Amino acid sequence: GAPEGPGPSGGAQGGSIHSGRIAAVHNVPLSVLIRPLPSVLDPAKVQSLVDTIREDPDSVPPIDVLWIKGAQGGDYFYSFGGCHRYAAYQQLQRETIPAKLVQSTLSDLRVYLGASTPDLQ
To answer: How far is CA 16 from CA 8, 13, 19, 109, 116, in A?
Structure first.
């Protein structure tokens, strides 16, 4: 019952030109979010965010997210922040979360994970 859609097919892929670069807000599924950085959550700040999304979902600005592809088009989304907003969105069991996508290169990731950087495929 997951919201399948991406990957219009599975075989015609072959050097597909992206629709030009477009860095804007996008609802990225919670099921494909990568979080390799833990952070102690606070119950007072999470309730405030949970109250903001419930009181007004358009009153909560998006978060920054790095968007990088692997050696095989495998798209990988990394989120270094909004950790609390994730707990608030997670509780609402919502299907996706607002997040600004930022196309980057593996080198940029090294600046952040210049130690536990895995091999993207």
So the answer is: 12, 6, 9, 24, 30
Contact status, residue 19 vs residue 88, Cβ threshold 8 Å: no
Q: How far apart are CA 101 and CA 79, in angstroms?
A: 10
Tell me if 81 is assigned to a ligand binding site. Answer: no
Domains in the chain, start-ordered, CATH in brackets? 22-117 (3.90.1530.10)
Q: Which two tokens stand for residue 37?
A: 């950085």
Q: What is the three-state SS of 19-65? A: CCCCCCEEEEEHHHEECCCCCCCCHHHHHHHHHHHHHCHHHCCCEEE
Alpha-carbon span 88 to 48, nearest angstrom? 9
Consult the annotation and say whether 83 binds a ligand.
Answer: yes
List Cβ neighbours of 58 (8 Å cut-off, separation of 6 or more).
none
Beta bridge partner(s), residue 102: 66
Q: Is 82 annotated as a binding residue?
A: yes
Would the annotation count 84 as a binding residue?
Answer: yes
Based on the number of CB atoms within 10 Å of its own CB, is 26 exposed (0-12), middle (13-18) or buried (19 or more)?
middle
